[PDB]
Amino acid sequence: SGFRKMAFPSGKVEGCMVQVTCGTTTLNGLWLDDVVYCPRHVICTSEDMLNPNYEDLLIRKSNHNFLVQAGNVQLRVIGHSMQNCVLKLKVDTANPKTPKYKFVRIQPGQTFSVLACYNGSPSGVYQCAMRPNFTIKGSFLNGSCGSVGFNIDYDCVSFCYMHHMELPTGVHAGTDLEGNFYGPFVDRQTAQAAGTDTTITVNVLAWLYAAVINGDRWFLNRFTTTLNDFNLVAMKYNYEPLTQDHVDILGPLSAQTGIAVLDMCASLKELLQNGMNGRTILGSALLEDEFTPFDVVRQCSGVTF
Amino acid sequence: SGFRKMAFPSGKVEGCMVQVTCGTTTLNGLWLDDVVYCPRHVICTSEDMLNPNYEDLLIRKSNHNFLVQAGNVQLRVIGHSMQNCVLKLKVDTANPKTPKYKFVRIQPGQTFSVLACYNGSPSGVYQCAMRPNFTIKGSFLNGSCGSVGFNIDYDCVSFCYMHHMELPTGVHAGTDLEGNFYGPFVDRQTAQAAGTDTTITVNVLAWLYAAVINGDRWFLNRFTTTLNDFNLVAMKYNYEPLTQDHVDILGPLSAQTGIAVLDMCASLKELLQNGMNGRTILGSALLEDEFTPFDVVRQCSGVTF
Numbered sequence: 001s002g003f004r005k006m007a008f009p010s011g012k013v014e015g016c017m018v019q020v021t022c023g024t025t026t027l028n029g030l031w032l033d034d035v036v037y038c039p040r041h042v043i044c045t046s047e048d049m050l051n052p053n054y055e056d057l058l059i060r061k062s063n064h065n066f067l068v069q070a071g072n073v074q075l076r077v078i079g080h081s082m083q084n085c086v087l088k089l090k091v092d093t094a095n096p097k098t099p100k101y102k103f104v105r106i107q108p109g110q111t112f113s114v115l116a117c118y119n120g121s122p123s124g125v126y127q128c129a130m131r132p133n134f135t136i137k138g139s140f141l142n143g144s145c146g147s148v149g150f151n152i153d154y155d156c157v158s159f160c161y162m163h164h165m166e167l168p169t170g171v172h173a174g175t176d177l178e179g180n181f182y183g184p185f186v187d188r189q190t191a192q193a194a195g196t197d198t199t200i201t202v203n204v205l206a207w208l209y210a211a212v213i214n215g216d217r218w219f220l221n222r223f224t225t226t227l228n229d230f231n232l233v234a235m236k237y238n239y240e241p242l243t244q245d246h247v248d249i250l251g252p253l254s255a256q257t258g259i260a261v262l263d264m265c266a267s268l269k270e271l272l273q274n275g276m277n278g279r280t281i282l283g284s285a286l287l288e289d290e291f292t293p294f295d296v297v298r299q300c301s302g303v304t305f
Numbered sequence: 306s307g308f309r310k311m312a313f314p315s316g317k318v319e320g321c322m323v324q325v326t327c328g329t330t331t332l333n334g335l336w337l338d339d340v341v342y343c344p345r346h347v348i349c350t351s352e353d354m355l356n357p358n359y360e361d362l363l364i365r366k367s368n369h370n371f372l373v374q375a376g377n378v379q380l381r382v383i384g385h386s387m388q389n390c391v392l393k394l395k396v397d398t399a400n401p402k403t404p405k406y407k408f409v410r411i412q413p414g415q416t417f418s419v420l421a422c423y424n425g426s427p428s429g430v431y432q433c434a435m436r437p438n439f440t441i442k443g444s445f446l447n448g449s450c451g452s453v454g455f456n457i458d459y460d461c462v463s464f465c466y467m468h469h470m471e472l473p474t475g476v477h478a479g480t481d482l483e484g485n486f487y488g489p490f491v492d493r494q495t496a497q498a499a500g501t502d503t504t505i506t507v508n509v510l511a512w513l514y515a516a517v518i519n520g521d522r523w524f525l526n527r528f529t530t531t532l533n534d535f536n537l538v539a540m541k542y543n544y545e546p547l548t549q550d551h552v553d554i555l556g557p558l559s560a561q562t563g564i565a566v567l568d569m570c571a572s573l574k575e576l577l578q579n580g581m582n583g584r585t586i587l588g589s590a591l592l593e594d595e596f597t598p599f600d601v602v603r604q605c606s607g608v609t610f
C-alpha cells in the first residue's frame with residue numbers, strides 16, 4: 001500500500017552526465033556513445049545576449065574551445081555541430097556506461113523523471129509532468145541546464161527532455177533531445193511567458209482510482225454522468241476535455257476497482273462543484289493531476305527495471 | 306527556482322541490490338563488500354507464522370538454503386548469522402560496486418530516500434520522513450521487503466532504513482541496518498498498530514522559508530511571537546514543541562530571507578488558527594512537514610554528490 005510520487009531509479013542516467021564548459025559558461029551534457037549533447041546556449045557570449053546568431057557563434061568556435069569533463073577525466077572533442085537548439089560534441093571515447101536508449105518526444109500530460117545536475121554531478125531526482133502549456137514545474141538553479149528528463153522501460157532509457165531555461169513565473173522550459181523546444185519558447189532573450197494552463201483531467205481520474213486502490217473512498221457516490229455533461233463541468237473549471245480514448249485508457253483501473261469511468265467522473269464533478277469539505281485524498285487537499293494512468297498501474301502492480 | 310520533493314540519485318544503491326530466496330519466500334537484500342543484509346523474516350515457514358523463534362529457525366538452516374542472485378549471477382553463501390532483526394549472509398564475492406558507506410540510525414523528523422525494489426530490481430525512488438511515531442508513509446507492495454532508505458553526502462551513502470512490513474493503517478515500519486526496529490514494532494504477528502502521530506513543526510517552518518525563497522509571501526505578517534506562546538498554539542494543534550535548538554537550526558534560512566524564526570512562527574500560528582482561505586503555498590493546500598531545514602538549504606543552494 002501507499003502512493004507516492006516516485007521517480008525512476010537514476011543510475012543509468014547518472015553514468016551519462018558530464019560537464020561542458022565554453023569560456024566562463026559551464027553546464028551539463030549527456031554523454032551517449034561518442035557524442036555529448038548539451039544546450040546550444042553554452043556558446044553564448046556577452047556581445048549580443050539578446051538576439052544572437054547561433055550559426056555565427058558556432059562557426060567561430062573550434063573543437064578545443066569545448067572542455068568536456070566526465071568525472072575527473074577530460075574528454076577530447078573531435079567534432080561539433082548544431083542540432084536545432086542542442087549541440088552535438090563528438091568526442092574520441094564512447095561512454096562505456098551508455099545504456100540502451102531512445103530519444104522520444106512526449107505529449108502534454110505525460111510524466112517523466114528529471115535528474116537535476118550541477119557541474120556534471122547529479123544532485124537529485126524527481127517526477128515532472130509536461131503541462132498542457134508545454135512547461136514543467138521543476139526545481140532548477142543556475143547551472144542546471146543540460147539536465148535531462150527520461151522514462152525507463154525494462155532496460156531502455158527513453159530521453160524526452162533537456163533543460164534550457166526558467167520562465168518569469170518560475171516554471172521551466174526545454175527541448176526534446178533532437179533540440180526542438182516543447183512549446184512556443186526560444187533560447188534568446190524575449191519577454192516570452194508561459195501561456196495559460198489547464199488541469200489534466202485524465203490524470204486526476206487516474207489519481208482518484210489510485211486513492212480507491214489505497215482505501216480512500218469517501219468521495220465515491222451512486223451517480224454516473226454522461227461524457228458530455230462531465231465535459232461541460234470540466235470546461236467550466238479549466239479542466240481539459242475527457243475523450244473516449246481517455247476512458248479507454250482508464251479501462252484497467254476501472255476494472256481493478258469495479259468503478260466505471262463515468263461513475264468516477266460523477267465523483268470528480270462533485271469534488272469540483274463542492275470541494276473536499278475539509279477532507280483529503282491520498283494526503284492532498286487538492287486534486288492532483290501529475291500521475292498518468294500508467295503511473296498508477298505501475299505503482300499499484302510493482303513493475304521493475 | 307522551484308521546490309520539489311527530491312530524492313538522492315539512486316545509482317550507488319542500485320548497484321547493491323540483490324534478490325534473496327529461502328524456500329518459496331523471495332525478498333531483497335543489500336550487498337555490501339562480502340555480506341548480504343536482509344530482513345530475517347525471509348526464514349519464516351508456514352509452521353508457526355504467529356510467534357516463531359527465529360533463533361530456532363536459523364539453527365535449522367544451512368548456507369545452501371539461501372539463494373542469492375545479483376542480476377543473473379548466483380552468489381555463493383558461505384556463512385549466515387543473525388543481527389537483531391536482520392540476517393547477515395556472508396558470500397564468497399565482494400560487491401565490486403560497493404560505495405563508501407556508513408550505517409546510521411536516524412531521528413524522527415529526519416528524511417531519507419527509499420529505493421523501492423522487487424526481486425532484487427529497483428523500481429522507483431522517493432523521499433520519506435521518519436514520523437514522530439517511528440513509521441514512514443511509503444509505497445511498498447508485497448515483495449518490497451529489504452528495500453533500503455539512505456542519504457548521500459558527497460560520495461558517502463549513509464544507510465538508515467531497511468523495510469520489514471506494513472502496519473494496518475497502511476504505513477510502513479522497519480529497522481536500521483543493525484537490525485533494530487524504529488519504534489515499538491516487532492517482526493511477529495501481533496495486533497501492533499502505529500501510535501498517535503504529530504506534525505514536525507521545525508520542518509513546517511523550514512518549508513515556509515522555502516516558500517519565501519521561491520516567492521510565496523502572502524502568509525507573512527508584521528507580528529512576532531514568543532517561543533512559549535507559539536508552543537501553546539502548537540500543542541493545541543498536535544504540533545511538536547519548537548525548541549531553541551530548532552530555532553538555531555533555522556538560522557541560515559532566517560538569514561537568507563531576513564525573516565526571524567519567531568517572526569515566521571507568528572505566520573504559522575495564523576495559518577493554524579485561520580487556515581489558508583483558499584490559497585496555496587508551494588502548490589499545497591496543506592502545511593507540509595516532510596522537508597528538513599537541510600533539505601531546503603540543499604535544494605535552494607545546489608549541493609551535488
Ligand SMILES: *C(=S)NCCOc1ccccc1
Nearest residue numbers: 041044049050165187188189
Ligand atoms: C546567448 S547570449 N543567447 C541569448 C539569450 O540566451 C538565452 C535565452 C533564454 C534562455 C537561455 C539562454
Ligand SMILES: *C(=S)NCCOc1ccccc1
Nearest residue numbers: 027041044142143144145164
Ligand atoms: C542554465 S545553466 N541557465 C543559467 C543561465 O542561462 C543562460 C546561459 C547562457 C546565456 C544566457 C542565459
Ligand SMILES: *C(=S)NCCOc1ccccc1
Nearest residue numbers: 099100101102155156157158
Ligand atoms: C530500448 S531503449 N531499446 C532501443 C535500443 O535497444 C538496444 C540498444 C543497444 C543494444 C541492444 C538493444
Ligand SMILES: *C(=S)NCCOc1ccccc1
Nearest residue numbers: 346349354355470492493494
Ligand atoms: C515468521 S512467520 N514470523 C511471524 C510473523 O512474521 C512477520 C510479522 C510481521 C512482519 C513481517 C513478518
Ligand SMILES: *C(=S)NCCOc1ccccc1
Nearest residue numbers: 332346349447448449450469
Ligand atoms: C515483504 S516482502 N513482505 C511481504 C509479506 O511479509 C511477510 C514475510 C514472511 C512472513 C510473514 C510476512
Ligand SMILES: *C(=S)NCCOc1ccccc1
Nearest residue numbers: 404405406407460461462463
Ligand atoms: C562516508 S560513507 N565515509 C565512510 C567510509 O569512507 C571511505 C570508505 C571506503 C574508502 C574510503 C573512504
